[PDB]
Amino acid sequence: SKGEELFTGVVPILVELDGDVNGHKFSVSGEGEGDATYGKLTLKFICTTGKLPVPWPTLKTTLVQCFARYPDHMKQHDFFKSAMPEGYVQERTIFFKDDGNYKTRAEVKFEGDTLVNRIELKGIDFKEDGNILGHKLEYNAISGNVNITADKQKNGIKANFKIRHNIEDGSVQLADHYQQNTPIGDGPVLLPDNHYLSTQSKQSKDPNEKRDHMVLLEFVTAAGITLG
Ligand code: NA
């Protein structure tokens, strides 16, 4: 695609999120860069409104799958880059088992040479002392396989995957994700054969940063289709 050509070197990234979870309102800003040749993302997120009222790990998926490394032989299945520069809408519902849900809407697009992710998030039906509003998650890595299907009716894609977040008492909190992406522009897109994105993230802190924040180092690689 012509959009893929936008991703052959290191691209600056900006993320801006406004959230409301059970009436707790917050905002997050992110800055970093992506290098899709290696599926590599480095980001720092800052809660601009004070302390983040939910755990950072529950926001990681919400806070740029256009930076996935697609293997050469799978490049015709990269929807995300084919929609650029005009971008796409990414919507999710994320179900926390035995707890509330996030509903997210984002637009991902170029503004100049910067890839920007602007998001709104709504959480409802959270338990006041469950794992999320009780802050019982470990500030712990996450990984998984994002399963992608074509959505021909919407000239886009669907995806579904589970995140298992470790809890401080040694249990696991499941977060079942449902996703849809649709192009913003009316230019040509690539609609993929079924495949997945193998994704892993390490979270850390800027020891010099007093604000509530998260630093991420993430790798995202398309898989599941064999050459030939
Ligand atoms: Na690159």
PDB file of C-alpha atoms and ligand atoms in Angstrom:
ATOM      1  CA  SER A   1       0.000   0.000   0.000  1.00  0.00           C
ATOM      2  CA  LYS A   2       1.026   3.620  -0.292  1.00  0.00           C
ATOM      3  CA  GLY A   3       0.345   4.000   3.452  1.00  0.00           C
ATOM      4  CA  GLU A   4       3.039   1.400   4.271  1.00  0.00           C
ATOM      5  CA  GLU A   5       5.656   3.729   2.811  1.00  0.00           C
ATOM      6  CA  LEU A   6       4.969   6.115   5.698  1.00  0.00           C
ATOM      7  CA  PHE A   7       6.332   3.571   8.118  1.00  0.00           C
ATOM      8  CA  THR A   8       9.787   2.649   6.710  1.00  0.00           C
ATOM      9  CA  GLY A   9      11.726   4.719   9.338  1.00  0.00           C
ATOM     10  CA  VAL A  10      11.204   5.964  12.898  1.00  0.00           C
ATOM     11  CA  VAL A  11       7.895   7.893  13.285  1.00  0.00           C
ATOM     12  CA  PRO A  12       7.016  10.190  16.284  1.00  0.00           C
ATOM     13  CA  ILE A  13       3.911   9.219  18.122  1.00  0.00           C
ATOM     14  CA  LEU A  14       1.440  11.315  20.241  1.00  0.00           C
ATOM     15  CA  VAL A  15      -1.381   9.819  22.266  1.00  0.00           C
ATOM     16  CA  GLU A  16      -4.157  11.789  24.021  1.00  0.00           C
ATOM     17  CA  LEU A  17      -6.844  10.100  26.071  1.00  0.00           C
ATOM     18  CA  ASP A  18      -9.848  11.454  28.043  1.00  0.00           C
ATOM     19  CA  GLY A  19     -11.432   8.973  30.328  1.00  0.00           C
ATOM     20  CA  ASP A  20     -14.280   8.563  32.770  1.00  0.00           C
ATOM     21  CA  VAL A  21     -14.451   5.394  34.788  1.00  0.00           C
ATOM     22  CA  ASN A  22     -17.325   5.238  37.214  1.00  0.00           C
ATOM     23  CA  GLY A  23     -17.303   9.085  37.405  1.00  0.00           C
ATOM     24  CA  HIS A  24     -13.543   9.295  37.972  1.00  0.00           C
ATOM     25  CA  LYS A  25     -12.384  11.634  35.190  1.00  0.00           C
ATOM     26  CA  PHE A  26      -8.795  11.689  33.926  1.00  0.00           C
ATOM     27  CA  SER A  27      -6.558  12.505  31.123  1.00  0.00           C
ATOM     28  CA  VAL A  28      -3.438  10.867  29.764  1.00  0.00           C
ATOM     29  CA  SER A  29      -0.807  12.223  27.289  1.00  0.00           C
ATOM     30  CA  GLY A  30       1.771   9.998  25.602  1.00  0.00           C
ATOM     31  CA  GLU A  31       4.850  10.674  23.517  1.00  0.00           C
ATOM     32  CA  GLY A  32       7.319   8.333  21.853  1.00  0.00           C
ATOM     33  CA  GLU A  33       8.169   6.774  18.595  1.00  0.00           C
ATOM     34  CA  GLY A  34       7.548   3.730  16.428  1.00  0.00           C
ATOM     35  CA  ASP A  35       9.695   1.719  14.070  1.00  0.00           C
ATOM     36  CA  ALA A  36       7.477  -0.679  12.264  1.00  0.00           C
ATOM     37  CA  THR A  37      10.387  -2.358  10.435  1.00  0.00           C
ATOM     38  CA  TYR A  38      11.129  -3.941  13.830  1.00  0.00           C
ATOM     39  CA  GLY A  39       7.535  -3.766  15.301  1.00  0.00           C
ATOM     40  CA  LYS A  40       9.077  -1.581  17.961  1.00  0.00           C
ATOM     41  CA  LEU A  41       7.335   1.078  20.099  1.00  0.00           C
ATOM     42  CA  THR A  42       8.869   3.221  22.926  1.00  0.00           C
ATOM     43  CA  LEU A  43       6.360   5.411  24.759  1.00  0.00           C
ATOM     44  CA  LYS A  44       6.004   7.437  27.950  1.00  0.00           C
ATOM     45  CA  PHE A  45       2.455   8.130  29.230  1.00  0.00           C
ATOM     46  CA  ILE A  46       1.652  10.777  31.834  1.00  0.00           C
ATOM     47  CA  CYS A  47      -1.570  11.212  33.818  1.00  0.00           C
ATOM     48  CA  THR A  48      -2.109  15.002  33.423  1.00  0.00           C
ATOM     49  CA  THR A  49      -4.910  15.246  35.898  1.00  0.00           C
ATOM     50  CA  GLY A  50      -3.014  13.821  38.929  1.00  0.00           C
ATOM     51  CA  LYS A  51      -3.115  10.216  40.105  1.00  0.00           C
ATOM     52  CA  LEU A  52      -4.552   7.788  37.571  1.00  0.00           C
ATOM     53  CA  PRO A  53      -7.808   6.455  39.119  1.00  0.00           C
ATOM     54  CA  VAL A  54      -7.423   2.996  37.438  1.00  0.00           C
ATOM     55  CA  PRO A  55      -4.296   0.820  37.094  1.00  0.00           C
ATOM     56  CA  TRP A  56      -1.920   1.710  34.281  1.00  0.00           C
ATOM     57  CA  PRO A  57      -1.926  -1.871  32.992  1.00  0.00           C
ATOM     58  CA  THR A  58      -5.697  -1.702  32.259  1.00  0.00           C
ATOM     59  CA  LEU A  59      -5.100   1.182  29.873  1.00  0.00           C
ATOM     60  CA  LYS A  60      -2.093  -0.280  27.920  1.00  0.00           C
ATOM     61  CA  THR A  61      -4.186  -1.756  25.039  1.00  0.00           C
ATOM     62  CA  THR A  62      -6.225   1.389  24.640  1.00  0.00           C
ATOM     63  CA  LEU A  63      -3.180   3.714  24.551  1.00  0.00           C
ATOM     64  CA  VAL A  64      -1.198   2.033  17.473  1.00  0.00           C
ATOM     65  CA  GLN A  65      -1.264  -1.307  15.690  1.00  0.00           C
ATOM     66  CA  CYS A  66      -0.062   0.448  12.460  1.00  0.00           C
ATOM     67  CA  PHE A  67       3.401  -0.099  13.948  1.00  0.00           C
ATOM     68  CA  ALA A  68       3.180  -3.903  13.723  1.00  0.00           C
ATOM     69  CA  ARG A  69       5.955  -5.611  11.816  1.00  0.00           C
ATOM     70  CA  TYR A  70       4.251  -7.497   8.999  1.00  0.00           C
ATOM     71  CA  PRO A  71       6.506 -10.155   7.488  1.00  0.00           C
ATOM     72  CA  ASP A  72       7.283  -9.577   3.892  1.00  0.00           C
ATOM     73  CA  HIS A  73       5.049 -12.415   2.734  1.00  0.00           C
ATOM     74  CA  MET A  74       2.078 -11.021   4.781  1.00  0.00           C
ATOM     75  CA  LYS A  75       2.304  -7.374   3.739  1.00  0.00           C
ATOM     76  CA  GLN A  76      -0.950  -7.584   1.731  1.00  0.00           C
ATOM     77  CA  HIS A  77      -2.783  -8.178   5.035  1.00  0.00           C
ATOM     78  CA  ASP A  78      -1.756  -4.923   6.758  1.00  0.00           C
ATOM     79  CA  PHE A  79      -4.998  -3.019   7.060  1.00  0.00           C
ATOM     80  CA  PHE A  80      -3.702  -0.579   9.549  1.00  0.00           C
ATOM     81  CA  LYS A  81      -0.938   1.012   7.443  1.00  0.00           C
ATOM     82  CA  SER A  82      -3.093   0.857   4.209  1.00  0.00           C
ATOM     83  CA  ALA A  83      -5.587   3.291   5.807  1.00  0.00           C
ATOM     84  CA  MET A  84      -2.876   5.922   6.349  1.00  0.00           C
ATOM     85  CA  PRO A  85      -2.470   8.878   6.244  1.00  0.00           C
ATOM     86  CA  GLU A  86      -6.193   9.589   6.611  1.00  0.00           C
ATOM     87  CA  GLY A  87      -6.305   6.899   9.420  1.00  0.00           C
ATOM     88  CA  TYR A  88      -8.878   4.744  11.035  1.00  0.00           C
ATOM     89  CA  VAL A  89     -11.315   4.605  13.810  1.00  0.00           C
ATOM     90  CA  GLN A  90     -10.548   1.974  16.500  1.00  0.00           C
ATOM     91  CA  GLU A  91     -13.355   0.984  18.848  1.00  0.00           C
ATOM     92  CA  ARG A  92     -13.312  -1.555  21.655  1.00  0.00           C
ATOM     93  CA  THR A  93     -15.283  -2.979  24.416  1.00  0.00           C
ATOM     94  CA  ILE A  94     -13.132  -4.488  27.117  1.00  0.00           C
ATOM     95  CA  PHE A  95     -14.926  -6.732  29.611  1.00  0.00           C
ATOM     96  CA  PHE A  96     -13.197  -7.177  33.007  1.00  0.00           C
ATOM     97  CA  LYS A  97     -14.496 -10.472  34.280  1.00  0.00           C
ATOM     98  CA  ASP A  98     -16.609 -10.187  37.376  1.00  0.00           C
ATOM     99  CA  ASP A  99     -16.196  -6.401  37.147  1.00  0.00           C
ATOM    100  CA  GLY A 100     -16.973  -3.405  34.891  1.00  0.00           C
ATOM    101  CA  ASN A 101     -16.195  -2.637  31.200  1.00  0.00           C
ATOM    102  CA  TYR A 102     -14.368  -0.059  29.223  1.00  0.00           C
ATOM    103  CA  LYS A 103     -15.801   1.229  25.891  1.00  0.00           C
ATOM    104  CA  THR A 104     -13.244   3.095  23.828  1.00  0.00           C
ATOM    105  CA  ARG A 105     -13.277   5.079  20.575  1.00  0.00           C
ATOM    106  CA  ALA A 106     -10.091   6.328  18.981  1.00  0.00           C
ATOM    107  CA  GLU A 107      -8.967   7.940  15.823  1.00  0.00           C
ATOM    108  CA  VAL A 108      -5.484   7.090  14.570  1.00  0.00           C
ATOM    109  CA  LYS A 109      -4.088   9.231  11.841  1.00  0.00           C
ATOM    110  CA  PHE A 110      -1.124  11.290  10.690  1.00  0.00           C
ATOM    111  CA  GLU A 111      -0.849  14.949  11.576  1.00  0.00           C
ATOM    112  CA  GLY A 112       2.105  15.983   9.487  1.00  0.00           C
ATOM    113  CA  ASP A 113       4.849  13.439  10.136  1.00  0.00           C
ATOM    114  CA  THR A 114       3.445  12.484  13.601  1.00  0.00           C
ATOM    115  CA  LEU A 115       1.170   9.459  14.117  1.00  0.00           C
ATOM    116  CA  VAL A 116      -1.533  10.502  16.563  1.00  0.00           C
ATOM    117  CA  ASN A 117      -3.884   8.414  18.601  1.00  0.00           C
ATOM    118  CA  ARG A 118      -6.793  10.380  20.153  1.00  0.00           C
ATOM    119  CA  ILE A 119      -9.050   8.468  22.433  1.00  0.00           C
ATOM    120  CA  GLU A 120     -12.121   8.625  24.542  1.00  0.00           C
ATOM    121  CA  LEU A 121     -12.811   6.061  27.133  1.00  0.00           C
ATOM    122  CA  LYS A 122     -15.892   5.271  29.273  1.00  0.00           C
ATOM    123  CA  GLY A 123     -15.953   2.769  32.073  1.00  0.00           C
ATOM    124  CA  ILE A 124     -19.153   1.656  33.783  1.00  0.00           C
ATOM    125  CA  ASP A 125     -20.275  -0.964  36.346  1.00  0.00           C
ATOM    126  CA  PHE A 126     -16.991  -1.232  38.158  1.00  0.00           C
ATOM    127  CA  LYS A 127     -16.873  -2.565  41.678  1.00  0.00           C
ATOM    128  CA  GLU A 128     -15.678   0.033  44.149  1.00  0.00           C
ATOM    129  CA  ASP A 129     -13.199  -2.495  45.693  1.00  0.00           C
ATOM    130  CA  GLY A 130     -12.616  -4.790  42.776  1.00  0.00           C
ATOM    131  CA  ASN A 131      -9.217  -5.202  41.162  1.00  0.00           C
ATOM    132  CA  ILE A 132      -9.517  -2.114  39.011  1.00  0.00           C
ATOM    133  CA  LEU A 133     -10.830   0.629  41.337  1.00  0.00           C
ATOM    134  CA  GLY A 134      -9.066  -1.090  44.271  1.00  0.00           C
ATOM    135  CA  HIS A 135      -5.737  -0.926  42.421  1.00  0.00           C
ATOM    136  CA  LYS A 136      -4.905  -4.578  43.012  1.00  0.00           C
ATOM    137  CA  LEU A 137      -3.010  -5.195  39.715  1.00  0.00           C
ATOM    138  CA  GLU A 138       0.686  -5.874  39.417  1.00  0.00           C
ATOM    139  CA  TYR A 139       2.565  -3.350  37.362  1.00  0.00           C
ATOM    140  CA  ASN A 140       3.421  -6.210  35.321  1.00  0.00           C
ATOM    141  CA  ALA A 141       4.047  -6.968  31.553  1.00  0.00           C
ATOM    142  CA  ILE A 142       1.361  -8.053  29.196  1.00  0.00           C
ATOM    143  CA  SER A 143       1.338 -10.126  26.116  1.00  0.00           C
ATOM    144  CA  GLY A 144      -1.035 -11.884  23.755  1.00  0.00           C
ATOM    145  CA  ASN A 145      -2.231 -12.588  20.256  1.00  0.00           C
ATOM    146  CA  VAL A 146      -4.676 -10.189  18.666  1.00  0.00           C
ATOM    147  CA  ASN A 147      -6.878 -12.259  16.364  1.00  0.00           C
ATOM    148  CA  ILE A 148      -7.791 -10.259  13.168  1.00  0.00           C
ATOM    149  CA  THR A 149     -10.609 -10.914  10.736  1.00  0.00           C
ATOM    150  CA  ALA A 150     -11.807  -8.949   7.727  1.00  0.00           C
ATOM    151  CA  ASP A 151     -15.063  -6.983   8.029  1.00  0.00           C
ATOM    152  CA  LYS A 152     -16.051  -6.484   4.421  1.00  0.00           C
ATOM    153  CA  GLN A 153     -19.371  -4.714   5.209  1.00  0.00           C
ATOM    154  CA  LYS A 154     -17.423  -1.964   7.043  1.00  0.00           C
ATOM    155  CA  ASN A 155     -14.360  -1.957   4.736  1.00  0.00           C
ATOM    156  CA  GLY A 156     -12.358  -2.749   7.861  1.00  0.00           C
ATOM    157  CA  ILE A 157     -11.411  -5.354  10.375  1.00  0.00           C
ATOM    158  CA  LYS A 158     -12.534  -6.941  13.668  1.00  0.00           C
ATOM    159  CA  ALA A 159     -10.222  -8.306  16.329  1.00  0.00           C
ATOM    160  CA  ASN A 160     -10.687 -10.248  19.556  1.00  0.00           C
ATOM    161  CA  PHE A 161      -8.201 -11.277  22.315  1.00  0.00           C
ATOM    162  CA  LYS A 162      -7.841 -11.821  26.019  1.00  0.00           C
ATOM    163  CA  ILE A 163      -5.469 -10.128  28.466  1.00  0.00           C
ATOM    164  CA  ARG A 164      -4.755 -11.791  31.743  1.00  0.00           C
ATOM    165  CA  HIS A 165      -3.550  -9.279  34.334  1.00  0.00           C
ATOM    166  CA  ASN A 166      -1.762 -10.577  37.399  1.00  0.00           C
ATOM    167  CA  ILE A 167      -3.300  -9.582  40.738  1.00  0.00           C
ATOM    168  CA  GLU A 168      -1.316  -8.872  43.847  1.00  0.00           C
ATOM    169  CA  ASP A 169      -2.857 -11.893  45.727  1.00  0.00           C
ATOM    170  CA  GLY A 170      -1.641 -14.260  42.971  1.00  0.00           C
ATOM    171  CA  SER A 171      -4.936 -14.514  41.110  1.00  0.00           C
ATOM    172  CA  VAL A 172      -5.539 -13.321  37.482  1.00  0.00           C
ATOM    173  CA  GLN A 173      -8.020 -10.658  36.212  1.00  0.00           C
ATOM    174  CA  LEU A 174      -9.278 -11.406  32.678  1.00  0.00           C
ATOM    175  CA  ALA A 175      -9.931  -8.549  30.287  1.00  0.00           C
ATOM    176  CA  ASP A 176     -11.777  -9.804  27.204  1.00  0.00           C
ATOM    177  CA  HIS A 177     -11.292  -7.473  24.277  1.00  0.00           C
ATOM    178  CA  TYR A 178     -13.553  -6.928  21.277  1.00  0.00           C
ATOM    179  CA  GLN A 179     -12.335  -4.576  18.605  1.00  0.00           C
ATOM    180  CA  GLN A 180     -13.443  -3.023  15.311  1.00  0.00           C
ATOM    181  CA  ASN A 181     -11.491  -0.755  12.989  1.00  0.00           C
ATOM    182  CA  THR A 182     -12.873   1.225  10.056  1.00  0.00           C
ATOM    183  CA  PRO A 183     -11.051   3.612   7.658  1.00  0.00           C
ATOM    184  CA  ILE A 184     -11.637   7.398   8.136  1.00  0.00           C
ATOM    185  CA  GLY A 185     -10.810   8.128   4.468  1.00  0.00           C
ATOM    186  CA  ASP A 186     -12.462   6.755   1.398  1.00  0.00           C
ATOM    187  CA  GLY A 187      -9.133   5.663  -0.254  1.00  0.00           C
ATOM    188  CA  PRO A 188      -8.246   1.954  -0.961  1.00  0.00           C
ATOM    189  CA  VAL A 189      -7.534  -0.345   2.011  1.00  0.00           C
ATOM    190  CA  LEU A 190      -6.215  -3.871   2.424  1.00  0.00           C
ATOM    191  CA  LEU A 191      -8.717  -6.358   3.919  1.00  0.00           C
ATOM    192  CA  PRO A 192      -6.732  -9.213   5.452  1.00  0.00           C
ATOM    193  CA  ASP A 193      -6.951 -12.970   5.545  1.00  0.00           C
ATOM    194  CA  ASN A 194      -7.327 -14.247   9.213  1.00  0.00           C
ATOM    195  CA  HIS A 195      -4.120 -13.755  11.102  1.00  0.00           C
ATOM    196  CA  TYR A 196      -2.960 -12.421  14.502  1.00  0.00           C
ATOM    197  CA  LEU A 197      -0.548  -9.893  16.006  1.00  0.00           C
ATOM    198  CA  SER A 198       1.853 -11.363  18.562  1.00  0.00           C
ATOM    199  CA  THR A 199       2.306  -8.505  21.046  1.00  0.00           C
ATOM    200  CA  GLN A 200       4.322  -8.035  24.157  1.00  0.00           C
ATOM    201  CA  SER A 201       4.931  -5.040  26.367  1.00  0.00           C
ATOM    202  CA  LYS A 202       7.302  -4.250  29.279  1.00  0.00           C
ATOM    203  CA  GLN A 203       6.274  -1.500  31.623  1.00  0.00           C
ATOM    204  CA  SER A 204       8.734   0.527  33.678  1.00  0.00           C
ATOM    205  CA  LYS A 205       9.088   3.970  35.334  1.00  0.00           C
ATOM    206  CA  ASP A 206      11.276   7.118  34.562  1.00  0.00           C
ATOM    207  CA  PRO A 207      12.990   7.224  38.050  1.00  0.00           C
ATOM    208  CA  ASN A 208      13.238  11.064  37.547  1.00  0.00           C
ATOM    209  CA  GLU A 209       9.481  11.553  36.930  1.00  0.00           C
ATOM    210  CA  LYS A 210       7.332  12.649  39.824  1.00  0.00           C
ATOM    211  CA  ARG A 211       4.008  12.552  37.975  1.00  0.00           C
ATOM    212  CA  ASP A 212       1.970   9.372  37.688  1.00  0.00           C
ATOM    213  CA  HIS A 213       3.225   7.767  34.484  1.00  0.00           C
ATOM    214  CA  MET A 214       4.129   4.650  32.614  1.00  0.00           C
ATOM    215  CA  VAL A 215       7.094   3.947  30.237  1.00  0.00           C
ATOM    216  CA  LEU A 216       6.539   1.190  27.712  1.00  0.00           C
ATOM    217  CA  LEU A 217       8.741  -0.814  25.432  1.00  0.00           C
ATOM    218  CA  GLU A 218       6.499  -2.892  23.078  1.00  0.00           C
ATOM    219  CA  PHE A 219       7.025  -5.256  20.170  1.00  0.00           C
ATOM    220  CA  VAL A 220       4.186  -6.191  17.777  1.00  0.00           C
ATOM    221  CA  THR A 221       4.588  -8.745  14.972  1.00  0.00           C
ATOM    222  CA  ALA A 222       2.053 -10.108  12.487  1.00  0.00           C
ATOM    223  CA  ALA A 223       1.902 -13.920  12.338  1.00  0.00           C
ATOM    224  CA  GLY A 224      -0.194 -16.942  11.488  1.00  0.00           C
ATOM    225  CA  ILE A 225       0.021 -17.121   7.658  1.00  0.00           C
ATOM    226  CA  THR A 226       2.745 -19.426   6.147  1.00  0.00           C
ATOM    227  CA  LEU A 227       4.907 -18.326   3.141  1.00  0.00           C
ATOM    228  CA  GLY A 228       3.697 -19.969  -0.214  1.00  0.00           C
TER     229      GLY A 228
HETATM  230 NA    NA B   1      10.432   1.352  10.487  1.00  0.00          NA
END
